Write a protein that binds this ligand. Structure first.
Ligand SMILES: CC/C=C\C/C=C\C/C=C\C/C=C\C/C=C\C/C=C\CCC(=O)O
Length: 133
């Protein structure tokens, strides 16, 4: 089910990430640094517990979750959110809720690349990751 997503992924394309960060209220200096950072995303499973690590020179995050079970999360920009990750149409869909707001982080595989679509408000960011060996 989620096997094709597992492994180590490196950022290779980013569109509209500044728009997404600005929609979330991220300050200009953080958005500068973030716009030049190329994170590595590691997705691992152990039974039905997934762990998703995002590593960079600026900030690191890690979450663990079961699909379809809500979890508390503190995001890279310090939002305290209620999260759930599920498979939907073969896509790994992560929904975050806080203060009545929502954002979605949708991952899909296209030609072996991992496409992450981030939506908040009207802002839609598309980031592309390539698999590391
Ligand atoms: C954690 C390292 C990943 C990306 C950029 C570097 C530092 C992050 C700090 C601030 C960014 C601010 C807001 C972004 C909001 C949510 C984080 C979601 C996705 C990170 C981007 C990704 O996984 O490619």
């Amino acid at each position: 089910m989620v096997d094709a997503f597992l492994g180590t992924w490196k950022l290779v394309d980013s569109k509209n990430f500044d728009d997404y960060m600005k929609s979330l209220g991220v300050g200009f200096a953080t958005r500068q640094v973030a716009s030049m950072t190329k994170p590595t995303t590691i997705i691992e499973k152990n039974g039905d517990i997934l762990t998703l690590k995002t590593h960079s020179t600026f900030k690191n995050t890690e979450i663990s979750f079961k699909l379809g079970v809500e979890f508390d999360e503190t995001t890279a920009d310090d939002r305290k959110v209620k999260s759930i990750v599920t498979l939907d149409g073969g896509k790994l869909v992560h929904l975050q809720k806080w203060d009545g707001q929502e954002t979605t982080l949708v991952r899909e595989l296209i030609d072996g690349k991992l496409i992450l679509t981030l939506t908040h408000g009207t802002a839609v960011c598309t980031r592309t990751y390539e698999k590391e060996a």
